[PDB]
């Protein structure tokens, strides 16, 4: 068959929303507190994550049907998925070549080691790379990548969500466009969809793991003081 | 007459405490979010102030008799005087030559203009320079400058102080050493003391003015998000 207008205008909006919020030159990174190779990377990475949340929020605001949700459900969805969306978009800067996130010269190239000097260990930093590699290999079209993010964000299974029925409906509509698009426009993608939805499950573990690690970090004031107000708010437990 | 042992060992400790917490090369400034000339300097100056609070705390911890105060009075004294102490120590980087704070190349030289792009206006930025100039002119010895700071910090007239009698006693002892020192070691300083105590009154206005300006800034989340956890805590109203 072939895509419908309503469906296609979802893709235009999402692709445009991503372009308006993701810079392939990573030029704004010079405004972050400089990276330093207890937890010397914490200051810089905290700024990177903070910056990203802001970007994920601008993108979310442009997902069709999201601005119609209650301020509360919008907050609940962002708080629970923020980290997952940061991880998804980060794939664009990930390099299978050097297994790192290359956002600039040697200064902004992020190795597994670096994330360690920011409060995280190898044991759990391992799944992040595996996720990045598996995701990178799927060679997603910009349209599929931007859709997966919109779908992740609209997961109705999030702590704190109220109108889980409406969220469920929206996520469903987006899942259609993603399925249709693969079928129509993606040659050789018979299993792709299932593989993508699979990636959403991997993001949950990565999410949970991060929560535990972050919790520890935040309870130690000498460390939480290195974070930013937005990060402390988005990953905080206040309800 | 001449100084006593107890008195002199107060001076050794204070001078050493300042040396251990003030770097004349301002080398750590490269770790702050870079300066940018709504409120583009806010990010960098917020880091400068944050850094300073940390330094003022390390100094305070070394003021004789301070660590014996209750954790509460220590917090109350720091919260109310922090800004004044930041202003006093800043005199060391102030230049009557160019009316600015020269902490590095053109990048870390702070003009009145810059503080404006950080949420503050000229109307009240004016008294800060006048204070800096008047203070600079007094050509204080390192011993007198470090004493004035210790005295400012131990003002018993601070909102939230409990044991105001003990604070009052400590500040009094320091006032002795300052008075004695001027007399014994400071040739030509008959009015100096009175001039110094005068400066404490100017710091109160500067303090009050800052409070009002800061209050406005902090109530606007798009701005407070640019501040640091420590700054938000020290200048915050939580009791």
């Amino acid at each position: 068959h072939m895509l419908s207008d309503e469906q296609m205008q979802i893709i235009n909006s999402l692709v445009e929303a991503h372009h308006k919020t993701y810079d392939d030159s990573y030029s704004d990174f010079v405004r972050f507190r400089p990276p330093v190779r207890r937890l010397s990377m914490l200051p810089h990475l905290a700024d990177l994550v903070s910056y990203s949340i802001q970007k994920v929020i601008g993108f979310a605001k442009m997902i069709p049907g999201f601005r119609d949700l209650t301020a509360e459900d919008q907050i609940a969805l962002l708080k629970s998925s923020a980290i997952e969306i940061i991880m998804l978009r980060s794939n664009q800067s990930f390099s299978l070549e050097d297994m790192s996130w290359s956002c600039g010269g040697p200064d902004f190239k992020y190795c597994i080691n670096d994330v360690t000097k920011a409060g995280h260990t190898l044991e759990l930093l391992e799944p992040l790379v595996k996720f990045q590699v598996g995701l990178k290999k799927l060679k997603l079209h910009e349209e599929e990548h931007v859709l997966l993010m919109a779908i992740c964000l609209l997961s109705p299974d999030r702590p704190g969500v109220q109108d889980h029925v409406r969220i469920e409906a929206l996520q469903d509509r987006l899942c259609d466009v993603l399925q249709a698009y693969i079928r129509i426009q993606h040659p050789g993608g018979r299993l792709l969809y299932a593989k993508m939805i699979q990636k959403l499950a991997d993001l949950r573990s990565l999410n949970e793991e991060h929560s535990k690690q972050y919790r520890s970090l935040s309870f130690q004031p000498e460390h939480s003081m290195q974070l930013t107000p937005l990060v402390l708010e988005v990953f905080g437990s206040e309800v | 007459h001449m100084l006593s042992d107890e008195q002199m060992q107060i001076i050794n400790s204070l001078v050493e405490a300042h040396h251990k917490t003030y770097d004349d090369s301002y080398s750590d400034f490269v770790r702050f979010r870079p300066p940018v000339r709504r409120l583009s300097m806010l990010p960098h100056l917020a880091d400068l102030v944050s850094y300073s609070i940390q330094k003022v705390i390390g100094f305070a911890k070394m003021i004789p008799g301070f660590r014996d105060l209750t954790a509460e009075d220590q917090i109350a004294l720091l919260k109310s005087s922090a800004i004044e102490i930041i202003m006093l120590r800043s005199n060391q980087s102030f230049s009557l030559e160019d009316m600015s704070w020269s902490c590095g190349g053109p990048d870390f030289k702070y003009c009145i203009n810059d503080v404006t792009k950080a949420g503050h206006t000229l109307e009240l930025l004016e008294p800060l320079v006048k204070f800096q100039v008047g203070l600079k002119k007094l050509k204080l010895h390192e011993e007198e400058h470090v004493l004035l700071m210790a005295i400012c910090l131990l003002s018993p007239d601070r909102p939230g102080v409990q044991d105001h009698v003990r604070i009052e006693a400590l500040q009094d002892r320091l006032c002795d050493v300052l008075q004695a020192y001027i007399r014994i070691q400071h040739p030509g300083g008959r009015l100096l003391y009175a001039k110094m105590i005068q400066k404490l009154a100017d710091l109160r206005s500067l303090n009050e003015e800052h409070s009002k300006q800061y209050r406005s800034l902090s109530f606007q989340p798009e701005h407070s998000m640019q501040l640091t956890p420590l700054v938000l805590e020290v200048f915050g109203s939580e009791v």
Binding site: I57, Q74, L78, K79, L230, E233, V234, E238 | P221, E222
Partner: peptide, 10 residues
């Protein structure tokens, strides 16, 4: 609270 998020969300 969530003061900052409410703001960023317009």
């Amino acid at each position: 609270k969530h003061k900052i998020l409410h703001r960023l969300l317009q």
